[PDB]
Each structure stands twice: as C-alpha cells, then as structure tokens.
Amino acid sequence: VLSEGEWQLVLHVWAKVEADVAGHGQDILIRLFKSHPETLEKFDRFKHLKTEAEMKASEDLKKHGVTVLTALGAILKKKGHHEAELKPLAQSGATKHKIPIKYLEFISEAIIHVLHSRHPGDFGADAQGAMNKALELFRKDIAAKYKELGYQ
Numbered sequence: 564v565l566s567e568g569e570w571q572l573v574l575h576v577w578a579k580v581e582a583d584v585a586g587h588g589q590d591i592l593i594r595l596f597k598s599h600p601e602t603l604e605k606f607d608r609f610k611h612l613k614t615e616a617e618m619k620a621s622e623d624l625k626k627h628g629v630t631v632l633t634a635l636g637a638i639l640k641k642k643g644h645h646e647a648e649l650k651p652l653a654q655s656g657a658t659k660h661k662i663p664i665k666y667l668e669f670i671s672e673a674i675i676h677v678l679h680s681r682h683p684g685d686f687g688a689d690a691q692g693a694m695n696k697a698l699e700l701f702r703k704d705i706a707a708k709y710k711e712l713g714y715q
C-alpha cells in the first residue's frame with residue numbers, strides 16, 4: 564500500500580496532467596510506440612503511422628490517448644480502492660486484447676518519463692517514487708485479475 568502523503572503527491576501531479584490530457588496523452592503513446600514498437604502491433608488503426616509527425620497528426624491516436632488517461636485517472640483518485648474500475652480493464656486485457664503485463668510496464672515507463680519531462684519541478688524523487696508505487700499497485704492488481712480469468 565501507499566501512504567496518504569504519497570497519494571497526495573500522485574494526485575498533485577495528476578492535476579497538471581489534467582490541464583492538457585490530450586497532449587500528455589499523445590506524448591505517452593508516442594514514447595511507447597517509439598521505445599517498444601512491438602506494442603504497435605496491438606493497434607491496426609495505428610499500424611500505418613510511420614513518423615512522429617503522422618503520429619501527432621492522428622485524431623485517432625490523440626483520442627486513444629485521452630481514453631487511456633481518463634481511465635487511469637479515475638483509478639488513481641480511488642486511492643487504492645479501485646477493483647470496480649479495474650475489473651473491466653483486466654477482463655478486456657485478458658480476453659479481447661491479450662496484453663501482457665510487460666506491455667503494461669512499458670507504458671508505466673512512458674508515463675513517468677512524460678511526467679518528468681513536462682513537470683520537472685513538481686516531479687522530484689519523492690513524487691516520482693510515489694507515482695512508481697501507484698503504477699505498480701495498478702499493474703499488480705491487474706496481474707491477479709488476469710490469473711483469475713485464466714490469462715496470467
């Protein structure tokens with residue numbers, strides 16, 4: 564678990580992401596794709612995106628970006644109390660999409676890195692350590708729901 568203090572730090576940065584979701588949304592995804600392009604394969608709609616510039620130009624990617632952050636955000640304001648919110652995503656990932664936990668750690672990486680580039684001064688070690696934990700709590704919870712559904 565995370566302390567109250569840790570949670571506030573997480574939500575304190577979350578607040579800034581919230582000022583430009585679409586924008587934080589696209590950076591995250593561009594970073595993921597770029598750093599681990601094997602993840603692109605889950606996306607057929609994105610398959611065709613050859614450059615950053617085209618990636619940046621897609622409404623579809625930008626939307627997808629917003630859809631990802633809003634879900635993650637609703638989960639974090641739950642401060643660890645997120646089974647209900649969590650459950651649909653674990654189902655879909657265990658059943659439709661088949662996303663490995665590995666894919667999820669990649670994404671965690673892109674998240675942190677974006678936050679740190681955009682928000683240096685609100686994203687110090689304490690905060691960063693706190694966001695790490697929370698993203699870890701999310702992946703862990705996911706991982707077990709997965710097993711329960713027979714995936715991993």
Ligand code: HEM
Pocket residue numbers: 602605606630631632634635651652655656659660662666667670
């Ligand atoms: C912070 C982590 C993430 C969150 C909150 C998240 C959330 C979502 C949401 C809310 C959807 C739409 C409903 C559903 O199909 O579940 C979605 C769909 C999907 N997610 Fe994720 N996602 C995350 C990470 C990933 C990763 C890392 C991948 C694959 C590498 C991924 C692959 C997919 C795919 C392929 C779909 C189907 C979307 C479509 O084309 O209609 N998600 N994800």
